[PDB]
Design a protein around this ligand. Structure first.
Ligand SMILES: C[C@@H]1CN(c2ncc(Cl)c(Nc3ccc4c(c3)n(CCC(C)(C)O)c(=O)n4C)n2)C[C@H](C)C1(F)F
Ligand SMILES: C[C@@H]1CN(c2ncc(Cl)c(Nc3ccc4c(c3)n(CCC(C)(C)O)c(=O)n4C)n2)C[C@H](C)C1(F)F
Lengths: 131, 131
């Protein structure tokens, strides 16, 4: 079944949120209604400001600032690893985090900078397992 | 736990999609980065085009049209019931559909017009239960 009786009066749809996220990622792949470019070193990543704000404390602060909310280009710290950013951007649109031994440190440092608490805590737990 | 091993290599976060949707609804309540007004009769509803496109076949068609994608105001058919639209807009941002005996017909007619198949099918199943 696609739905159930929630704790409240409303009928709740089980796959709705993941279906919305899937469709937002489809818009991203097709470059539909993307309204910002995130520049990390040489690399450029097109995205939707609302998705970035929904996932990152840093992007929330940037796009709620009256001066910066209108910027079409956002440059991150040039010390940010582009692959780490790419993995986190993918995560934002999919719920899947491609953590590997070779990228975990860059992913963690990027999540810290982006203020993505859950990802930071997760990276920390995986690092602790290896020691 | 916040995460699990998905069918693929990636670590998947269980609540990520619903957390993104919750944050998108918070942006809507605060009128943050809303980029469209949907006019239904007298009523006005501010929203995010990408959320509308992710949930509705009609909004997908409107905002992928080269001429209409830039419109800041969208007028729906004046025969659309504002309460039915409100319930569906709430559903888009929350996954909860407030269906009641008094609104089910308007909600169904609105979902048909908006091309929200899952909601139409659901309304049809609930109507069938009463007969
Ligand atoms: C009043 C306002 C409500 N908040 C909020 N609203 C909307 C968004 Cl887009 C949003 N996005 C957002 C902001 C910060 C985040 C954030 C999202 N995430 C990601 C959380 C999820 C569950 C998406 O992984 C995260 O780790 N941090 C630190 N947050 C939290 C903020 C602190 C607030 F209190 F100021
Ligand atoms: C190539 C492109 C991919 N599609 C798609 N991509 C992105 C979005 Cl925003 C999106 N949104 C969208 C469009 C139509 C919808 C639609 C969303 N929904 C809602 C589906 C969910 C699961 C969100 O309830 C629905 O019932 N209908 C009919 N769909 C389906 C369309 C038909 C397509 F094939 F042309």
């Amino acid at each position: 079944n696609l739905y159930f009786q929630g704790a409240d009066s409303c009928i709740q749809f089980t796959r709705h949120a993941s279906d919305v996220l899937l469709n937002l990622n489809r818009l991203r792949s097709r470059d539909i209604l993307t309204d910002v470019v995130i520049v990390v070193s040489r690399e450029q990543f097109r995205a939707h400001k609302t998705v970035l704000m929904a996932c990152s404390g840093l992007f929330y602060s940037i796009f709620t600032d009256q001066l910066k909310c209108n910027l079409s280009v956002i440059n991150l710290d040039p010390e940010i690893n582009p692959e780490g950013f790419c993995i986190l951007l993918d995560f934002m649109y999919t719920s899947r985090l491609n953590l590997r031994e070779g990228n975990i440190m860059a992913v963690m440092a990027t999540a810290m900078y982006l203020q993505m608490e859950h990802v930071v805590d997760t990276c920390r737990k995986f690092i602790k397992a290896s020691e």
